[PDB]
Write a protein that binds this ligand. Structure first.
Ligand SMILES: Nc1ncnc2c1ncn2[C@@H]1O[C@H](COP(=O)(O)O)[C@@H](O)[C@H]1O
Ligand SMILES: [Ca+2]
Length: 419
């Protein structure tokens, strides 16, 4: 079996990752056939972090691109497509400066074009793209697009699909198949995949990614309390105010100030609750901030920082998260830890440690009060970051779309046997 390869650079707000995928040439249109071959994490910040030094953005890719040259056989370099897709870090920079955004894209394009891969462009994905391609990735990998059964006995209803929830650094996405009528065209997605129609809801909440929420909570704590109730008692840091308020996500709030934590789970809950506006809804039903959302339904996979945060609660804190009530309890216990108590649980590097309480509280509120999961619907959510040896994110679905590897219809319409 002769193999083909494809590469996606996922240029996220907080960092870039490279994924190399491989598939058999003769089976390339089968669902689930493409899988991850290798990956590489680019050292340092996201490409948007080089807004004032755009030349560095291209150079930042060099070491991982050098790895791609070793990972993909030489004779196949020329015919291996390479894409770069950038998400909310670049969407935010584009609000601030379309010129600086264009210079970054120019710098990554110049670097990528120097390599022997078939470079197919650097683009900024829409929030819809990001949500939908993640949903496609999960369902493709798990073979949910297969028509199950056989002639005269098809499973009915059709095999369910897995909803997707992605918590990145700068935005968060929710995407799932729905039978509810569409009320907002911006949220409505129709896919034709392997002869089947999927009616899908998606939304991306810009500024509701992990890093931006943490900045917004810090801005809020500074204004309301002058201490940080989500940070652990005994933890303090010198906050440079310029960095706090420079983001599009925090400009709305408002040189160095000392800020200390207080382990106040109840005040932390109150601070997080200010992130969700539930006061108004121009639709029949909303999530929050007046965004249309039908009832959540079916199974979901929650990946990226949902997975990393829950993994911390289960593996480091040793707490169950099987129910919303358990997640709330685990958040409380975590937020009530002092800095010495929390450090005692983590023998190694301590980066991100002071932030788990806030992120866990955010996640719990986002799911329960934002998306309106309840105990029944939450039981259907799993936290995982990989399926079939492949990282779950939008990259695979993006590559499948741009390489035209998912057919709208089966060959010869399968003689019409799925009609
Ligand atoms: N081990 C971790 N614990 C908590 N957050 C993380 C971890 N690894 C990455 N993150 C954060 O998760 C967010 C999305 O990460 P990613 O989906 O890997 O780009 C970013 O804010 C990252 O800093
Ligand atoms: Ca991401």
């Amino acid at each position: 079996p002769a193999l083909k390869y494809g590469i996606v650079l996922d240029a996220g707000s907080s960092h870039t990752s490279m994924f190399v995928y491989k598939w058999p040439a003769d089976k390339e249109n089968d669902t689930g056939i493409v899988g991850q071959h290798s990956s590489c994490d680019v050292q340092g910040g996201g490409i948007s972090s080089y807004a004032n030094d755009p030349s560095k953005a291209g150079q930042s890719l060099v070491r991982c691109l050098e790895q791609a040259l070793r990972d993909v056989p030489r004779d196949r370099h020329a015919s291996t497509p390479l894409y770069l897709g950038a998400t909310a870090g670049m969407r935010l920079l584009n609000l601030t400066s379309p010129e600086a955004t264009a210079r970054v894209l120019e710098a990554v394009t110049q670097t990528l074009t120097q390599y022997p891969f078939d470079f197919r462009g650097a683009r900024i994905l829409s929030g819809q793209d990001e949500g939908v391609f993640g949903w496609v990735t999960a369902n493709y990998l798990l073979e949910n697009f297969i028509k199950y059964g056989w002639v005269g006995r098809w499973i009915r209803p059709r095999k369910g699909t897995l909803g997707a929830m992605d918590l990145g650094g700068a935005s968060t996405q929710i995407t799932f198949e729905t039978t509810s009528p569409s009320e907002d065209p911006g949220n409505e997605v129709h896919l034709r995949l392997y002869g089947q129609h999927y009616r899908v809801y998606t939304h991306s909440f810009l500024c509701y990614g992990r890093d931006q929420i943490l900045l917004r909570l810090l801005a809020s704590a500074l204004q309301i309390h002058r201490f940080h109730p989500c940070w652990p008692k005994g933890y303090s840091t010198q906050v440079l105010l310029q960095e706090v308020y420079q983001s599009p996500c925090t400009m709305g709030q408002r040189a160095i100030v000392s800020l200390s934590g207080t382990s106040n789970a109840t005040l932390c809950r109150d601070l997080v609750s200010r992130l969700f506006n539930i006061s108004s809804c121009p639709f029949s039903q909303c999530s929050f901030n007046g965004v249309f959302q039908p009832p959540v339904a079916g199974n979901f996979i929650a990946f990226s920082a949902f997975y990393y945060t829950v993994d911390f609660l289960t593996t480091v804190m040793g707490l169950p998260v099987g129910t919303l009530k358990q997640l709330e309890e685990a958040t409380e216990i975590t937020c009530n830890q002092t800095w010495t108590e929390l450090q005692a649980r983590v023998p190694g590097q301590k980066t991100r440690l002071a932030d788990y309480c806030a992120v866990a509280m955010f996640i719990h509120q986002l799911l329960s009060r934002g998306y309106h999961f309840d105990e029944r619907s939450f039981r259907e959510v799993v936290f995982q970051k990989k399926a079939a040896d492949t990282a779950v994110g939008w990259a695979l679905g993006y590559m499948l779309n741009l390489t035209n590897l998912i057919p709208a219809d089966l060959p010869g319409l399968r003689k019409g046997t799925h009609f």
